[PDB]
Write a protein that binds this ligand. Structure first.
Ligand SMILES: Cc1cc2nc3c(=O)[nH]c(=O)nc-3n(C[C@H](O)[C@H](O)[C@H](O)COP(=O)(O)O)c2cc1C
Ligand SMILES: Cc1c(Oc2c(F)cccc2F)c(OC(C)C)nn1-c1ncc(C2CC2)cc1F
Ligand SMILES: O=C(O)c1cc(=O)[nH]c(=O)[nH]1
Length: 347
């Protein structure tokens, strides 16, 4: 099985509930209140596993405390030619250049509408839903693509993600620069504020691990100025850290998994400091263990996500991360996850 074939089968099996229901019962230690919601546990599935919102209920069954679908583009688009996903088994890493393959807003809108009240119950029970918004390859006006996403899927989401950090769409990461970023996020927040109160989601910005010090300072400034609700830190890296062994290490695309882990943790640490710990962070990149999760929480993450670990450990990795995180919190004298958020910054 090539990686993309495995991905398609994984989504199909998850959607059909063909996996053991997670025996691990979440303790009160793992509960987090952030972004106006209760999260039963802080371990989410990152964007790019369920791009088209086909497997949401199966992912809650796997034991995730929250699910992020997408990225979703306004119009349907095929993304890049195959092959476009590469396994680096020696590195516990993946390189992908999917290029925002998307069923598009209308198809995803109808899928989420079909289970909207089921989701309202799950959200009330501490299992929220995120929607990650992308832009079409041929789009002239990036802000209008994101605005369309807010209008169509904002009403169906607990939080929205403005993905300005895909490495696989020409000119996208340049939306991370200051004057353009202020214009883009002002338009996104105006559109969000225009939705009816019960349909009004939190808005987060998802950033690359590949930003300059200047880029990070500029993002922190704009996020505080505009009242952005949170940051997702980080997307995949276009860097190739020294020591990658995989034969496929020089494939074009975003690198995920263990080689991204500490680059992502350091970006969390920097963004927490630049926002004075006042901007909730979802920490993501190379999480495979309770230790990986707690390092991101101590660096300033309120929640974490994983993806690549699923491809090396399978579905059991979710319960593993939760059980190890609970054990480490007890060992280090934390009452719960909330007490550990940003603990490294208090020395
Ligand atoms: C195959 C693949 C597809 C992805 N697609 C998306 C996407 O559509 N939108 C997005 O924001 N991030 C996407 N990501 C990035 C993940 O959400 C996450 O930020 C990154 O993989 C780091 O987490 P991990 O090391 O636990 O996989 C994708 C990652 C992979 C491996
Ligand atoms: C998470 C996941 C599986 O694990 C399972 C499961 F073994 C049973 C049910 C659900 C699952 F997710 C799996 O099982 C293969 C189909 C045997 N593949 N896989 C996987 N997922 C995503 C990708 C992305 C391209 C990078 C690649 C993959 F290999
Ligand atoms: O669709 C993709 O190529 C994709 C998008 C994104 O945000 N991140 C990633 O690694 N791949």
């Amino acid at each position: 099985l090539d990686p993309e074939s495995a991905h398609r089968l994984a989504v199909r099996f998850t959607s059909l509930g063909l996996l053991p229901r997670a025996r691990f019962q979440d303790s009160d230690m793992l509960e987090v209140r952030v972004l106006g919601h209760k999260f039963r546990n802080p371990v989410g599935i990152a964007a790019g596993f369920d791009k088209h919102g086909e497997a949401v209920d199966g992912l809650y069954k796997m034991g995730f405390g929250f699910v992020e679908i997408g990225s979703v583009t306004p119009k349907p688009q095929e993304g890049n030619p195959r092959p476009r996903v590469f396994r680096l088994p020696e590195d516990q890493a993946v390189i992908n250049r999917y290029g925002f393959n998307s069923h598009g807003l209308s198809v995803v809108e109808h899928r989420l509408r079909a289970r909207q009240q089921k989701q309202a119950k799950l959200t009330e029970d501490g299992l929220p839903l995120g929607v990650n918004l992308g832009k079409n390859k041929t789009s002239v006006d990036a802000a209008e693509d994101y605005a369309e996403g807010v209008r169509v899927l904002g009403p169906l989401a607990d939080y929205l993600v403005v993905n300005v950090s895909s490495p696989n769409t020409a000119g996208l990461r340049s939306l991370q620069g200051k004057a353009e970023l202020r214009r883009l996020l002002t338009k996104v927040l105006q559109e969000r504020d225009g939705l009816r109160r019960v349909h009004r989601p939190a808005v987060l910005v998802k950033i690359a691990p590949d930003l300059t010090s200047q880029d990070k300072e500029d993002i922190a400034s704009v996020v505080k100025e505009l009242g952005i609700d949170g940051l997702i830190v980080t997307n995949t890296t276009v860097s190739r850290p020294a020591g990658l062994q995989g034969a496929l290490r020089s494939e074009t695309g975003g690198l995920s998994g263990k080689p991204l882990r500490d680059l992502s943790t350091q970006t969390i640490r920097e963004m927490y400091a630049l926002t004075q710990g006042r901007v909730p962070i979802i920490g993501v990149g190379g999480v495979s263990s309770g230790q990986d999760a707690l390092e991101k929480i101590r660096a300033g993450a309120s929640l974490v996500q994983l993806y690549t670990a699923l491809t090396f450990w399978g579905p059991p990795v979710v319960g593993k991360v939760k059980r190890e995180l609970e054990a480490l919190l007890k060992e280090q004298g934390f009452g719960g996850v909330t007490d550990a958020i940003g603990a490294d910054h208090r020395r």
